[PDB]
Design a protein around this ligand. Sequence first.
Ligand SMILES: [Cu+2]
Ligand SMILES: [Cu+]
Ligand SMILES: [Cu+]
Ligand SMILES: [Zn+2]
Ligand SMILES: [Zn+2]
Lengths: 155, 155
Amino acid sequence: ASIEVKVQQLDPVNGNKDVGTVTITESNYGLVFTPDLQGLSEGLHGFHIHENPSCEPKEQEGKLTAGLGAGGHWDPKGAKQHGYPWQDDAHLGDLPALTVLHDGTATNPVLAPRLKHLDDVRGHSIMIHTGGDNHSDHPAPLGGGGPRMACGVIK
Amino acid sequence: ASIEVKVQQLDPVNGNKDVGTVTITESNYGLVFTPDLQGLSEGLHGFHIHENPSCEPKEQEGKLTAGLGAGGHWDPKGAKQHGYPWQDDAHLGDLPALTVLHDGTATNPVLAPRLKHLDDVRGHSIMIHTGGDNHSDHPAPLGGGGPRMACGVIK
Ligand SMILES: [Cu+2]
Ligand SMILES: [Cu+]
Ligand SMILES: [Cu+]
Ligand SMILES: [Zn+2]
Ligand SMILES: [Zn+2]
């Protein structure tokens, strides 16, 4: 029971770059996401499972935008609302925020209690945003994650 | 339905100092700890529920040691080993590590899936360590948390 996801920093122009991996394992309380990332900006970053198994950029109003190919937050139960990892009426893809230390590394594992089986995340993508995550659609949509900084396709 | 815990930086020499609060609420997946702290060193900090409802120091080897009055990690099931928040044979008091940002503040909530009711944690203390937490007794005991930096009594 384990999936090692290769994660890359997104740059539609200069090119993407490997920043490490995120290993997903099953615990008695839900899926555990264990990062081993580097070269990221210090702080808390929005961390979610997105609908499409793609990290490719997509054209948006005449602008090749990073990670748009991944689609929106994975929401199989139609919550149509961004929320907490422990909130039942929030996107099923809403994970705890990722902590990146001063040295640009992330190794602190986080639990997603609503995700129970590894197979459930296969066929999707995992996204790391430039901004944080206040687990609400206010004052900013999707927790204020904003732009997509890094991404990995979940095989 | 919440418990607001007053947290203080421990200073046996010149007196404990207020650093904020930690609010505990219940979710359908366990107790949620929402910090609102400031003045702490940046980084990940060991965060656990300790056995005694006291944050006072105790004499050990002739040294008045900060927070020893709280005792060890709360372990009502006698796991006798430090582990993950989602690990059943680990101290019940083992919580996810606390994230302190560059500006010394901590506001990111964390979930303790093995803790179900607010009353279960009443009569104990919550501790913040100077070091982090690798959720193991290897290579360092108690996750490498080391000295006790801040603490609050849960009522
Ligand atoms: Cu810093
Ligand atoms: Cu996202
Ligand atoms: Cu502790
Ligand atoms: Zn969401
Ligand atoms: Zn412990």
